[PDB]
């Protein structure tokens, strides 16, 4: 798995740091105290969906007609190849 | 008595009579011995010594 997303990489790093700070490693020389294991590590670190947006925000607009923007984007991709040939 | 005497006659000697050898089974006889199955290459020995499995618990 490659890393090409700052947000996901940072989330994974934070998860690793939390896991390291929450685990206790007994010394290899014995004398390990009571463990009291937890049968599920994923339960202690449940996967949480990042919040996409807040519940409410101040309304701002520019009159760009987002539907018009979608139509323009769809049209541009169709004729780009023909446009480049027509340019010469 | 004769068999026990013969056993003493072959006590500790390799390549002894077959009848005195284990009768467990053909498959187990040809199976790798305890020493043979424990043979580990130096690379794997070093890897195990450096990073053996650790005992860790999620408590704090």
Short mmCIF file of C-alpha atoms in Angstrom, two decimals:
data_model
loop_
_atom_site.label_atom_id
_atom_site.label_comp_id
_atom_site.label_asym_id
_atom_site.label_seq_id
_atom_site.Cartn_x
_atom_site.Cartn_y
_atom_site.Cartn_z
CA UNK A 1 0.00 0.00 0.00
CA UNK A 2 1.33 3.41 -1.04
CA UNK A 3 0.60 6.71 0.72
CA UNK A 4 -0.61 9.57 -1.49
CA UNK A 5 -3.00 11.32 0.91
CA UNK A 6 -1.91 13.58 3.76
CA UNK A 7 -5.18 13.20 5.68
CA UNK A 8 -5.20 9.39 5.64
CA UNK A 9 -1.48 9.23 6.47
CA UNK A 10 -1.92 11.60 9.42
CA UNK A 11 -4.93 9.64 10.67
CA UNK A 12 -2.95 6.39 10.48
CA UNK A 13 0.01 7.98 12.27
CA UNK A 14 -2.27 9.23 15.06
CA UNK A 15 -3.85 5.77 15.32
CA UNK A 16 -0.40 4.19 15.61
CA UNK A 17 0.67 6.67 18.29
CA UNK A 18 -2.52 6.03 20.28
CA UNK A 19 -2.04 2.26 19.98
CA UNK A 20 1.57 2.52 21.15
CA UNK A 21 0.61 4.77 24.08
CA UNK A 22 -2.24 2.44 25.10
CA UNK A 23 -0.34 -0.88 25.01
CA UNK A 24 1.97 -2.10 27.77
CA UNK A 25 4.92 -4.31 26.78
CA UNK A 26 6.19 -6.66 29.47
CA UNK A 27 9.99 -6.97 29.76
CA UNK A 28 11.53 -10.06 28.20
CA UNK A 29 13.24 -10.78 31.55
CA UNK A 30 9.99 -12.04 33.10
CA UNK A 31 8.28 -10.59 36.16
CA UNK A 32 5.33 -9.58 33.98
CA UNK A 33 2.36 -8.36 36.09
CA UNK A 34 -1.27 -9.30 35.46
CA UNK A 35 -2.26 -8.70 31.83
CA UNK A 36 -6.08 -8.59 31.81
CA UNK A 37 -6.21 -8.82 28.03
CA UNK A 38 -8.90 -7.36 25.78
CA UNK A 39 -10.22 -9.85 23.23
CA UNK A 40 -10.49 -7.21 20.47
CA UNK A 41 -7.99 -4.49 19.59
CA UNK A 42 -10.30 -3.05 16.92
CA UNK A 43 -12.93 -2.52 19.62
CA UNK A 44 -10.56 -0.22 21.52
CA UNK A 45 -9.78 1.71 18.30
CA UNK A 46 -13.03 1.75 16.31
CA UNK A 47 -12.93 3.16 12.79
CA UNK A 48 -14.57 6.59 12.70
CA UNK A 49 -15.81 8.26 9.53
CA UNK A 50 -14.28 11.76 9.20
CA UNK A 51 -16.84 14.55 9.29
CA UNK A 52 -17.51 15.79 5.76
CA UNK A 53 -18.98 19.15 6.81
CA UNK A 54 -20.56 20.93 9.75
CA UNK A 55 -24.31 20.79 10.30
CA UNK A 56 -24.94 24.44 9.35
CA UNK A 57 -22.98 27.13 7.53
CA UNK A 58 -23.54 30.69 6.37
CA UNK A 59 -25.02 30.80 2.87
CA UNK A 60 -22.82 32.24 0.12
CA UNK A 61 -23.42 32.24 -3.62
CA UNK A 62 -21.97 33.54 -6.87
CA UNK A 63 -24.70 32.79 -9.41
CA UNK A 64 -22.50 30.33 -11.31
CA UNK A 65 -25.40 27.89 -11.91
CA UNK A 66 -23.62 24.75 -10.70
CA UNK A 67 -25.74 22.78 -13.17
CA UNK A 68 -24.35 24.99 -15.93
CA UNK A 69 -20.85 24.25 -14.63
CA UNK A 70 -21.51 20.50 -14.87
CA UNK A 71 -22.80 20.85 -18.43
CA UNK A 72 -19.76 22.93 -19.42
CA UNK A 73 -17.40 20.37 -17.88
CA UNK A 74 -19.17 17.53 -19.70
CA UNK A 75 -19.05 19.39 -23.02
CA UNK A 76 -15.39 20.41 -22.71
CA UNK A 77 -14.11 16.84 -22.29
CA UNK A 78 -15.96 15.75 -25.44
CA UNK A 79 -14.48 18.27 -27.90
CA UNK A 80 -10.98 18.65 -26.41
CA UNK A 81 -9.47 16.16 -28.85
CA UNK A 82 -11.20 17.74 -31.84
CA UNK A 83 -10.32 21.21 -30.54
CA UNK A 84 -6.61 20.38 -30.37
CA UNK A 85 -6.65 19.10 -33.96
CA UNK A 86 -8.56 22.18 -35.13
CA UNK A 87 -5.94 24.37 -33.44
CA UNK A 88 -3.45 23.27 -36.13
CA UNK B 1 15.82 -63.32 27.78
CA UNK B 2 17.57 -63.77 24.43
CA UNK B 3 16.12 -60.51 23.08
CA UNK B 4 17.13 -58.58 26.20
CA UNK B 5 20.65 -60.00 25.95
CA UNK B 6 20.84 -58.98 22.28
CA UNK B 7 19.64 -55.50 23.27
CA UNK B 8 22.58 -55.19 25.65
CA UNK B 9 24.82 -56.50 22.86
CA UNK B 10 23.61 -53.53 20.76
CA UNK B 11 23.27 -50.97 23.56
CA UNK B 12 24.16 -47.52 22.23
CA UNK B 13 25.37 -48.80 18.85
CA UNK B 14 24.04 -47.19 15.68
CA UNK B 15 22.58 -49.32 12.89
CA UNK B 16 21.07 -51.97 15.16
CA UNK B 17 18.71 -54.79 14.14
CA UNK B 18 15.47 -53.54 12.63
CA UNK B 19 13.25 -55.70 14.86
CA UNK B 20 14.53 -53.72 17.86
CA UNK B 21 13.64 -50.41 16.17
CA UNK B 22 10.38 -48.55 16.66
CA UNK B 23 7.25 -50.19 15.24
CA UNK B 24 5.20 -46.96 15.26
CA UNK B 25 4.46 -46.76 11.52
CA UNK B 26 6.12 -46.34 8.14
CA UNK B 27 5.07 -42.70 7.77
CA UNK B 28 6.35 -41.61 11.19
CA UNK B 29 9.62 -43.51 10.78
CA UNK B 30 10.45 -41.57 7.60
CA UNK B 31 9.21 -38.31 9.13
CA UNK B 32 11.82 -35.70 10.01
CA UNK B 33 13.34 -36.22 13.44
CA UNK B 34 12.99 -33.69 16.25
CA UNK B 35 16.47 -32.32 15.55
CA UNK B 36 15.92 -32.22 11.78
CA UNK B 37 12.62 -30.34 12.12
CA UNK B 38 14.32 -27.82 14.44
CA UNK B 39 17.01 -26.95 11.87
CA UNK B 40 16.86 -23.19 11.26
CA UNK B 41 19.15 -21.21 8.97
CA UNK B 42 21.45 -18.63 10.54
CA UNK B 43 19.47 -15.79 8.95
CA UNK B 44 16.22 -16.99 10.53
CA UNK B 45 17.98 -17.59 13.86
CA UNK B 46 19.27 -14.01 13.87
CA UNK B 47 15.84 -12.69 12.87
CA UNK B 48 14.14 -14.59 15.70
CA UNK B 49 16.75 -13.52 18.26
CA UNK B 50 16.55 -9.86 17.24
CA UNK B 51 12.73 -9.57 17.12
CA UNK B 52 11.08 -12.40 19.07
CA UNK B 53 7.34 -12.25 19.65
CA UNK B 54 6.56 -9.96 22.58
CA UNK B 55 3.85 -10.17 25.24
CA UNK B 56 1.76 -6.98 25.09
CA UNK B 57 -1.66 -6.11 26.50
CA UNK B 58 -4.00 -3.18 25.85
CA UNK B 59 -4.44 -1.76 29.36
CA UNK B 60 -3.04 1.79 29.36
#
